[PDB]
Each structure stands twice: as C-alpha cells, then as structure tokens.
Amino acid sequence: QSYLGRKKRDNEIQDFPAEDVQVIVEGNEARISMTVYPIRSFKKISVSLVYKQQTLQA
Amino acid sequence: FRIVDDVTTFNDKSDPVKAEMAVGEANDFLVSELKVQLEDQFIGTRTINTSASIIKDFI
Secondary structure, three states: OHHHHHHHHOOOEEEOOOOOOEEEEEOOEEEEEOOOEEOOOOOOOOOOOOOOOOOOOO | OOOOOOEOOOOOOOOHHHHEHHHHHHHHHHHHHHHHHHHHHHOOOOOOOOHHHHHHHHO
16 A cells, blocks of 8 residues: 555556455465556547527626 | 697507607607617627626616
C-alpha cells in the first residue's frame, strides 16, 4: 500500500483499491494479488455540443 | 365661424379611432413612429442577456 501510494503521489498510476490488495503466505511461497488502474495519455476528446432556446422576461 | 366636429365619413361612432380624426391621427403617428424607431435600433443587434431590459427602457 505504501509503494502504490507513492506511485499515486507521483502520478505514475491513476488509482488503486486498497481493499482488494490480498496477501497469502504458505511455506516458502508468498502469493500476492493487487489491482491497479493504469495511467493513460489523452488521445481523443469527444464534445457533444447541444443548442437550446432560452426565454427572457422583464 | 367655427367647426362643429371633425367626424370622418365612417359613421360608426363606436370606434373613435376610425370616427374621430384626432384620435386616429394620434394612433397613426404613435404606431408609425414606434415602428420606424424599433427597426433602426434593435434589428441586427445581438440577442444579449440584457436585451429585454434595454428594450423595456427604450419603450
């Protein structure tokens, strides 16, 4: 969690859920499972511009 | 000598605008002048948010 927190601090990753980080230890082996939302660079921006009427008074 | 009345040929006295020259004269100039002034002022201008307030102040 501390290691992933530093990555989020430096914006190397988007975010991670701390709850899903599960660690299982059995003998020599130590199974680790984690979830990470990777950082991505924008390459497409879609804009949906909608025109509408407005009524004025006074 | 004096003029008894300025009544028009239209005998329907219920409508003083048509029957009376003076009343109809004021209506014509009031309507005509308002028609010309509004066109020169507001037509062709942007429909800004304060357009309604400006038109009300002009009236």
